[PDB]
Ligand binder design. Structure first.
Ligand SMILES: CC(=O)Nc1nnc(S(N)(=O)=O)s1
Length: 310
């Protein structure tokens, strides 16, 4: 079967992560966001935000400098294991919408960024004397939701993560990317060409030229999933599965990009049929919008899984 991914962490008044860990239909949950990068953040540690989650406390560096990395995410720490017990993959997402001034400035800081995240969030290692924001929890991988400021250093980060993954062959870890629909994508086409992602979720909303809506109304633009299949072929991500990223309600993205379940089926059955090896499934922005959009007594994400399984 194909997979259903969804982001969580940035939903206004979102329910805690375990609620979605309890939702059968979800296969992958991207937790957003590591939103502050080491080159420009306080203390030069990565920083995090998970909306209404965590108690507000932050770590400080060895020299007393206040960071933006949250240290009291009790609920998330408790909930991730529930997701993984139910068979789900939990990916920690890097970037997100806010703030808009974060980037990577050198290959060195790229390596060091991924090293830091691997130590903080990957396997517990005796040689690590740094922060463990989710304690003994080990995430299943990293998602690159780079929304601003170009594509420097993300390839190096992915390559560094892979190297670290390969030193733990008894466990599988995953790398993913969320480019927008226009090729080249200013943030992620470089990483996609130069480094290997397992999953790539194209955000099929907010860009008129190629949106999922233009599949339904072809006067709007041209849905370009075919082009994304072609562009993988020269890339180091040539074996990536491609997912159709969609808004989970009317108000989750810009006006006019939401599709009804029936509209999604028409798109998905066409493309699932056309690319049975490359089509990975659906990505949803995002969990709260899905949960609040109840259709026939079930949230949007459940109807998305129906379409993928039917
Ligand atoms: C993966 C993903 O979609 N990330 C997003 N970040 N901001 C979005 S928004 N508010 O412009 O619709 S979507």
């Amino acid at each position: 079967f194909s997979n259903l991914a969804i982001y969580w962490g940035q939903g206004p008044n979102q329910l805690r992560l375990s609620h979605f860990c309890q939702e059968t239909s979800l296969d992958i949950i991207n937790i957003g966001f590591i939103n502050y990068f080491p080159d420009m953040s306080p203390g030069h540690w990565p920083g995090s935000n998970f909306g209404n989650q965590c108690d507000g406390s932050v770590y400080v560096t060895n020299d007393g400098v206040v960071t933006k990395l949250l240290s009291g995410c009790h609920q998330i720490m408790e909930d991730i294991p529930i997701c993984q017990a139910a068979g789900k993959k939990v990916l920690l997402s890097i970037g997100g919408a806010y703030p808009p001034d974060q980037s990577i400035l050198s290959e060195d800081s790229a390596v060091a960024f991924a090293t830091f995240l691997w130590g903080a969030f990957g396997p517990v290692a005796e040689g690590w004397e740094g922060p463990r924001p989710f304690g003994d929890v080990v995430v299943d991988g990293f998602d690159f939701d780079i929304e601003h400021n170009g594509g420097f250093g993300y390839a190096t980060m992915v390559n560094t993560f892979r190297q670290y993954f390969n030193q733990v062959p008894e466990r599988k870890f995953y790398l993913s990317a969320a480019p927008q629909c226009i090729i080249p994508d200013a943030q992620l086409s470089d990483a996609i060409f130069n480094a290997a992602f397992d999953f790539i979720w194209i955000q099929y909303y907010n860009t008129a030229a190629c949106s999922a809506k233009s599949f339904i109304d072809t006067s709007l633009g041209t849905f370009n999933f075919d082009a994304w299949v072609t562009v993988l072929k020269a890339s180091a991500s040539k074996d990536a599965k491609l997912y159709v990223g969609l808004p989970a309600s009317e108000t989750a993205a810009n006006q006019g990009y939401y599709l009804t379940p029936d509209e999604v089926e028409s798109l998905v059955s066409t493309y699932m049929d056309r690319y049975p090896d490359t089509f990975g499934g659906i990505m949803l922005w995002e969990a709260t919008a899905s949960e609040n959009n109840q259709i026939d007594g079930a949230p949007y994400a459940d109807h998305m899984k129906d379409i993928l399984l039917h």
